[PDB]
Amino acid sequence: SLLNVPAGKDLPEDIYVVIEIPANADPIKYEIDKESGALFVDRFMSTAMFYPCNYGYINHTLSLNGDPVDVLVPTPYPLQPGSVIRCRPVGVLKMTDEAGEDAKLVAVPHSKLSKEYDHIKDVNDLPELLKAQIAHFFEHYKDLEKGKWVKVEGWENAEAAKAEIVASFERAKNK
Amino acid sequence: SLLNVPAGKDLPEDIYVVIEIPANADPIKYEIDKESGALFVDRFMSTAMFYPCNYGYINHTLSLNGDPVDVLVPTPYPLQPGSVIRCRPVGVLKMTDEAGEDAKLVAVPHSKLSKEYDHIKDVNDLPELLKAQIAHFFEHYKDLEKGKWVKVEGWENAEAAKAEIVASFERAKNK
Amino acid sequence: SLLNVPAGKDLPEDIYVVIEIPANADPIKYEIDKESGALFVDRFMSTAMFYPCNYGYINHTLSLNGDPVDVLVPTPYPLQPGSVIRCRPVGVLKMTDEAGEDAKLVAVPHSKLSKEYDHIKDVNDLPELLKAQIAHFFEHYKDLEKGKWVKVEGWENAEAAKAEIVASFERAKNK
Amino acid sequence: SLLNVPAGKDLPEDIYVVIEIPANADPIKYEIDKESGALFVDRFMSTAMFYPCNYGYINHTLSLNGDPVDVLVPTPYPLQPGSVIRCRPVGVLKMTDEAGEDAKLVAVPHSKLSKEYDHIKDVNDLPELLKAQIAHFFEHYKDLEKGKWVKVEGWENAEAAKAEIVASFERAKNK
Amino acid sequence: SLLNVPAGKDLPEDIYVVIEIPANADPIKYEIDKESGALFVDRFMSTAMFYPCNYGYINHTLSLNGDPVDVLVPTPYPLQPGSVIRCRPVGVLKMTDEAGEDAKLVAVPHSKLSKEYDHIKDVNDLPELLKAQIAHFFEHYKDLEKGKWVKVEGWENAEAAKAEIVASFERAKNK
Amino acid sequence: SLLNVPAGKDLPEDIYVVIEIPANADPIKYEIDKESGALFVDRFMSTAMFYPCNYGYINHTLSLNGDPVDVLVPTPYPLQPGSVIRCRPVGVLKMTDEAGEDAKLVAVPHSKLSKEYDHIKDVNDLPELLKAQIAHFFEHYKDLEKGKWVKVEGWENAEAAKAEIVASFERAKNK
């Protein structure tokens, strides 16, 4: 089942992301239920917006806000919800939402899946438009479902992304 | 796995439907296999028709005809086969097919997923065109795969829908 | 889970294929991970080509190259990745790739799912264009991802297809 | 302009069909406007049905119900609305509705487009399932339209289809 | 030609809208060219947003910003670009941008197309969520366009929508 | 009419391309008819291949093979058939086929449409994988067409692309 996928072949450089929401999909927010392993409908998003990249998480990871680290994965074609993709982390989006800090990593497909991202080694290598899209998406997608709000503090590098992997992996085995 | 999703948070008011066939899909009839939990192709439907709502079942339920209670779930966008959606029952379609009574519930997305169905509290609140579509679909979708035939006896209320949940949940733990 | 689907109701005449790649899809090569049962992204294909039929495998089978027997399944509409389809084998495509012989079966939907393939009993009953498409796909889809190359030796009959099922089923229980 | 497209390269054996509704599309009934040549929305279909083949008309023809002769065209992938396809007539579906008698031709793609239809020379060569679905569609797609009924009378051969096209071509000029 | 389509069957109560951008489509902003009547790509949208309704214009109208009056049209399925829809105005969205004042009409499908919109007679009858999404879209779709801003001023009723159409129709001739 | 669209705002640096075949579409080869300006089906492709970019032509140009100059245009989402895109030439693909020599231009979206292509000034700036896929497509898409072959000769720069457009524009008038 999806609950027994490994975090990565070699964390934090070489990880698996479990995809929950494909890039450019209808505005249905899916989430994998941690008891069943099944895809749950979490909500029907109320803004006319879409995730600019595939969205999911690293299994066996516990972030400070109680859930596994979440990750955005650019691909040339949208992936199936429930699929698992081998990636390498390249950067991190720092925000605050109503409960203090949130981070969302960006990870690119690993070279065994594709060579089109070989030259993206860090956060400054990502296209500027795509970074600006992601930031704009996270600042507005909950505008109409409020008591909710997000603010974007800015981009960090591959080493900050890796640190967040490692600390949340470690945090999982214990609490 | 899909075999360990709960029937509901609070049956019969607050249930989970396991989606097998999305609204407006190609005419492939999928079914979740109760031994494996996997999506099986049940048949390629022979009429040029589509399910007017997402179609699936409540887990841990046994109806009088040997299978879990089946349910139609209107959403603003079609859902993935295998996904699980939180809903509240609002009515029931009564038919007879070659083996006596069949019921199919209608349940709407629960308010935590969407507010667009808050005002639908019972069977008379459903749009008339959608009810007429569903009835027409169930009367004709098997026209070309005969020895099969369906006749529609008519709509019942939210309390009859809830009763069918409860009796089939109870019926499951025992036989 | 997908790891506990049976090879077939009655091997080798009556088998289940686990679908990994739908017909006519984006050029994402998915594969079911044999440890987890989950759909993995195997690679993003580099040619502008698509599988001309749905593609997958028979569970509980071990071919000579270390993986389960793979199968192409024509359907009137593309199937979901992860779905299971009841089929009957009708022929086999023989190739050599860099590691000696490869076979890929063709199996058609079983008559309980559809009647549109009833008249296809063997390999000469398949439309010639579809056979020529499949051969052309397998000869070129890896042209740009080389150190890889495929050559097509030609079509065999339903009895050779069945033999390959049986030998790989037997080969699985033991090694 | 679509108003200037010919009736065919060689009537009645070699014709063009202007496509109004794609096979397997959403339940929106499009029509070419005669004055402007633009694609108009004639209506949203109220049954959960789709056209089993692409649908349109032959330009410069006038049937006795006072519009261009309509044709149904099977193709391996749906066509774009407003597109023009070269075809051969193979049959006619005769029916009666609440306005009187009607007739629908069936034409396959010309050999210059595709060889896949070269063995279909007449109405009994069409796959039995397609004929059954086309008939069932015409008899039920207007069922939720108050006042509108369709009764299918039977099929007629290629020769009957050719005569309708000649008759209706002549009648478009001479009047 | 789309340049020859009428403004409406009976202005301002019964109009035609030429559709430029489908609801829920890829983020490509199409426009009909005035000279040629062809569909041009005006631009690729840079936010991750989609139009919440089909968008287009009324032909033979000229607003005080010097183009045809635009309309937003909700429909149950997205429409084709270049297609013409018969509609009734029910409201107007007033806004200001970096070029000055602007106004966007909202029109529903005429009763001849669909009865589903017959209870919507005016701007307060639109579903509350659709109005909120349309406003939010206009206020944010140009956020990554340097120099371009939108401020939404409020809604106005059906009567205001009719006056804009008359005013702009007259102004298209008399000039 | 598409027959009246200009060759470009400022040839040869700023051109319009009329789109005939979308990137990543079904294997239907569309062409604009010269007389009518309608979209015709030229053929159903017989290989399992798709165009790796949108394909079309520049109006009011005539190449030495006696039709308009064709162009391949990469865009972030597929375009509609019949739509017109503003572009800049950056390269040419030279080949020979069974009718003789041929050439295919590559043009990216103009800066007014999208800034994403502003760093692509010439043929060596295109992503290496796209060039490889375009070449491989042209060399294999007609492989199952009896009598038809394609041999790719090499690329040429933006300057060569501009000269072809001038040459073919002049040749469209003066004749």
Pick from B44, B49, B144 the residue to mutate for testing the C interface (most C CBs within 10 Å). Answer: B44
Query: Which parts of chain D fold into alpha helices (H)?
Result: 128-140, 158-173
User: What's the length of chain A?
Assistant: 175
For residue E132, give every residue at least 6 positions away whose Cβ sits within 8 Å of its Cβ, in sequence order, or none: A46, A144
Whether D and A touch, i.e. at least 3 CB pairs below 8 A, reads as no
The whole-angstrom separation of Cα F80 and Cα D81 is 11
- Please return the burial class of B74, using the count of CB atoms within 10 Å of its CB with bins 0-12, 13-18 and 19+: buried
> Chain B contacts of C84, Cβ < 8 Å?
33, 36, 38-41
The whole-angstrom separation of Cα A121 and Cα A90 is 6
- Amino acid identity, position B89: P
- Closest chain D residue to F47 measured between Cα atoms? D114
Q: Is the Cβ–Cβ distance between E51 and E137 less than 8 Å? A: yes
Instruction: Find the radius of gyration of the CA atoms of chain F.
Output: 15
Backbone angles phi, psi at A72, to 5 degrees: -105, 130
CA distances from D161 to D10, D60, D97, D107, D155 (A): 14, 16, 20, 9, 10
Chain B closest-CA separation from residue D51 CA (Å): 7
Residue C162, both tokens: 């069945």
Residue F2: DSSP 8-state:
G
Experimental technique behind these coordinates: X-ray
> Chain E contacts of F81, Cβ < 8 Å?
none
CA distances from D105 to B60, D53, D60, D124, E124 (A): 51, 12, 16, 14, 47
- Using alpha carbons, select from F3, F63, F9 the residue that is nearest to residue F35: F3
For residue B37, give every residue at least 6 positions away whose Cβ sits within 8 Å of its Cβ, in sequence order, or none: B1, B2, B3, C1
The whole-angstrom separation of Cα A116 and Cα A24 is 20
Backbone angles phi, psi at C29, to 5 degrees: -95, 110
Residue C68, both tokens: 């389960």
Nearest to E44 among F18, F84, F113 (CB): F113
The whole-angstrom separation of Cα E98 and Cα E93 is 17
For residue C3, give every residue at least 6 positions away whose Cβ sits within 8 Å of its Cβ, in sequence order, or none: C34, C37, C59
Crossing angle between the packed helical segments E128-140 and A128-140, to the nearest 10 degrees? 150
Q: Is the Cβ–Cβ distance between B89 and B73 less than 8 Å? A: no
Q: Which three-class secondary structure state does DSSP give residue C111?
A: coil
Backbone angles phi, psi at D138, to 5 degrees: -60, -30
The whole-angstrom separation of Cα F75 and Cα E45 is 12
CB pairs under 8 A between A and B: 53
CA distances from F121 to F1, F56, F87, F105, F124 (A): 32, 20, 12, 14, 8
The whole-angstrom separation of Cα A10 and Cα A112 is 14
Q: Is the Cβ–Cβ distance between D93 and D104 less than 8 Å? A: yes
Rounded (5°) CA angle C33-C39-C44: 100
Rounded (5°) CA angle B114-B116-B118: 90
CA distances from D149 to D95, D99, D142, F116 (A): 10, 9, 7, 54
Chain A closest-CA separation from residue F27 CA (Å): 18
Going by their DSSP bridges, the two strands D70-73 and D54-57 should be labelled as: antiparallel
Chain-chain contact of F1 with D1 (C-beta, under 8 angstroms): yes
The whole-angstrom separation of Cα B109 and Cα B105 is 13
Residue E9: DSSP 8-state:
S
Q: 3-state SS of E33-80?
A: CCCCCCEEEEEECCCCECCCCEEEECCCCCCCCCCCCEEEECCCCCCC
The whole-angstrom separation of Cα D157 and Cα D121 is 9
Chain B closest-CA separation from residue E111 CA (Å): 14
Segment holding C20, helix H or strand E: strand C15-21
Q: 3-state SS of chain B?
A: CHHHCCCCCECCCEEEEEEEECCCCCCEEEEECCCCCCEEEEEECCCCECCCCEEEECCCCCCCCCCCCEEEECCCCCCCCCCEEEEEEEEEEEEEECCEEEEEEEEEECCCCCCCCCCCCCHHHCCHHHHHHHHHHHHHCCCCCCCCCEEEEEEECHHHHHHHHHHHHHHHHHC
Tell me the CATH number at D121: 3.90.80.10
Dihedral angle over CA of D162, D168, D173, D175, nearest 10: 150
Dihedral angle over CA of C144, C145, C148, C149, nearest 10: -20
- Closest chain A residue to B78 measured between Cα atoms? A26
The whole-angstrom separation of Cα B107 and Cα B121 is 10
Full residue range of the structural domain in which residue C141 is found: 1-175
- Amino acid identity, position B62: L
Rounded (5°) CA angle E115-E117-E119: 100
Chain F closest-CA separation from residue C129 CA (Å): 7
Q: Is the Cβ–Cβ distance between C12 and C165 less than 8 Å? A: yes
- Using alpha carbons, select from A84, A82, A77, A80 the residue that is nearest to residue A110: A84
Total count of domains within chain B: 1
Burial C77-114 (b: 16+ CB within 10 A, else e): ebbbbbbbbbbbbbbbbbbeeeeeebbbbbbbbbeebb
Going by their DSSP bridges, the two strands C54-57 and C39-44 should be labelled as: unpaired
Beta bridge partners of B108: B88
- Using alpha carbons, select from E9, E3, E2, E13 the residue that is nearest to residue E161: E13
Dihedral angle over CA of F59, F62, F63, F64, nearest 10: 170
Helix, strand, coil tally for chain F in percent (to 5): 20, 35, 45
Phi-psi region at A121: left, alpha or beta (left = phi > 0; alpha = psi -120 to 50): alpha
The whole-angstrom separation of Cα F93 and Cα F137 is 12
The whole-angstrom separation of Cα C24 and Cα D24 is 16
The whole-angstrom separation of Cα D87 and Cα D109 is 4
> Chain C contacts of B42, Cβ < 8 Å?
113
Q: 3-state SS of chain A?
A: CHHHCCCCCECCCEEEEEEEECCCCCCEEEEECCCCCCEEEEEECCCCECCCCEEEECCCCCCCCCCCCEEEECCCCCCCCCCEEEEEEEEEEEEEECCEEEEEEEEEECCCCCCCCCCCCCHHHCCHHHHHHHHHHHHHCCCCCCCCCEEEEEEECHHHHHHHHHHHHHHHHHC
Q: Is the Cβ–Cβ distance between C17 and C56 less than 8 Å? A: yes
Beta bridge partners of D9: none
Crossing angle between the packed helical segments B128-140 and D128-140, to the nearest 10 degrees? 150
Whether A and F touch, i.e. at least 3 CB pairs below 8 A, reads as yes
Residue F88: DSSP 8-state:
E
What number of CA atoms fall less than 13 Å from residue E156's CA on the CB side? Answer: 16
Indicate if the alpha-carbon torsion angle F113, F115, F121, F127 is positive or negative: negative
Neighbouring chains of A at 3+ CB pairs under 8 Å are B, C, E, F
Chain-chain contact of B129 with D144 (C-beta, under 8 angstroms): yes
The whole-angstrom separation of Cα C76 and Cα F73 is 32
Chain-chain contact of E24 with A26 (C-beta, under 8 angstroms): yes
Instruction: Find the radius of gyration of the CA atoms of chain B.
Output: 15
Residue B99, both tokens: 């083996």
The whole-angstrom separation of Cα C80 and Cα B29 is 11
The whole-angstrom separation of Cα C44 and Cα A87 is 13
- Using alpha carbons, select from E30, E38, A159, E127 the residue that is nearest to residue F38: E38
For residue F17, give every residue at least 6 positions away whose Cβ sits within 8 Å of its Cβ, in sequence order, or none: F54, F56, F57, F58, F71, F73, F84, F85, F86, F87, F107
The whole-angstrom separation of Cα C88 and Cα C112 is 11
Residue A105, both tokens: 């990593």
- Amino acid identity, position B172: A
Q: Is the Cβ–Cβ distance between E74 and E53 less than 8 Å? A: yes
Q: Is the Cβ–Cβ distance between E17 and E107 less than 8 Å? A: yes
Strands (E), chain F: 15-21, 28-32, 39-44, 54-57, 70-73, 84-97, 100-109, 150-156
The whole-angstrom separation of Cα D48 and Cα B24 is 8
The whole-angstrom separation of Cα A1 and Cα A18 is 12
> Chain B contacts of E129, Cβ < 8 Å?
115-116
Phi-psi region at D128: left, alpha or beta (left = phi > 0; alpha = psi -120 to 50): alpha
Nearest to F80 among E33, E39, E44 (CB): E39
Backbone angles phi, psi at F143, to 5 degrees: -65, -30
Residue E138, both tokens: 């206009």
Nearest to E27 among F5, F77, F84 (CB): F77
The whole-angstrom separation of Cα E39 and Cα F106 is 21
The whole-angstrom separation of Cα D43 and Cα D29 is 5
Backbone angles phi, psi at C3, to 5 degrees: -65, -20
The whole-angstrom separation of Cα A83 and Cα A109 is 13
> Chain B contacts of A144, Cβ < 8 Å?
none
Q: Is the Cβ–Cβ distance between D61 and D34 less than 8 Å? A: no
Rounded (5°) CA angle B1-B4-B7: 135
Q: Is the Cβ–Cβ distance between D157 and D121 less than 8 Å? A: no
Q: How many CB atoms are closer than 10 A to CB B146?
A: 9
The whole-angstrom separation of Cα A161 and Cα A8 is 14
